[PDB]
Amino acid sequence: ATKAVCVLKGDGPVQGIINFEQKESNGPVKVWGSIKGLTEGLHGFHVHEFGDNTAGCTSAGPHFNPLSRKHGGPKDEERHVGDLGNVTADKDGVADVSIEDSVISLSGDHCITGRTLVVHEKADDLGKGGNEESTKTGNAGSRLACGVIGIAQ
């Protein structure tokens, strides 16, 4: 298996730890961990193109989109590679993350390692919001915490 990891931090209360594991080359990737400091409800959760945190999470650029598709949800055919949908925080402000995804990878052109994982202010509408921005960002709003995805032991 191949593994990766991301420590999420920002300017406010949101912080988290996310692990990635890919059992076989080009296979599905398990994504799991925890994020705290969130408002209760859905928060957009995406891999953004650049692993650049120079000026904070803004430096990461748009959703990782090597195939030049429109924004969608993780279970849509029309999605960005980085479109991992939403995480859900409960009234503890904690999102317990447990995802399996078949489009991200830890190698090749779909590789997310060296890019930035971001948790957003608002829900991602998965491209179903009916304004222009829905099919670009999902209307998920600002970036609360982020980190560069790194190679893990």
Ligand X SMILES: CNC[C@H](O)c1ccc(O)c(O)c1
**Which residues contribute to the annotated binding site for Zn(2+)?**
63, 71, 80, 83
Identified catalytic residue from 43, 79, 80, 115: 80
Burial of 76 (0-12, 13-18, 19+ CB in 10 A): middle
83 binds, among a copy of itself, Cu ion, Zn ion, none (CB under 5 to 8 A by kind): Zn ion
Task: Please choose, out of 18-26, 60-68, 87-95, 118-126, the segment that lies near ligand X by the rule CB under 6 A.
Answer: 18-26
Residue 54 vs residues 51, 58, 63, 101, 142: alpha-carbon distances, Å:
9, 9, 17, 28, 17
SS3 110: helix
Residue 46 contact, options ligand X, a copy of itself, Cu ion, none, Cβ 5-8 Å cut-off depending on partner type? Cu ion
DSSP code of residue 83: E
Q: Would you list which residues are annotated within the binding site for Cu cation?
A: 46, 48, 63, 120
Active site residue 110: no
How many residues make up the chain in this entry?
153
What residue ranges bind Cu ion (CB under 5 A)? 46, 118
What residue ranges bind ligand X (CB under 6 A)? 21-23, 26-30, 100, 102-103, 105, 110
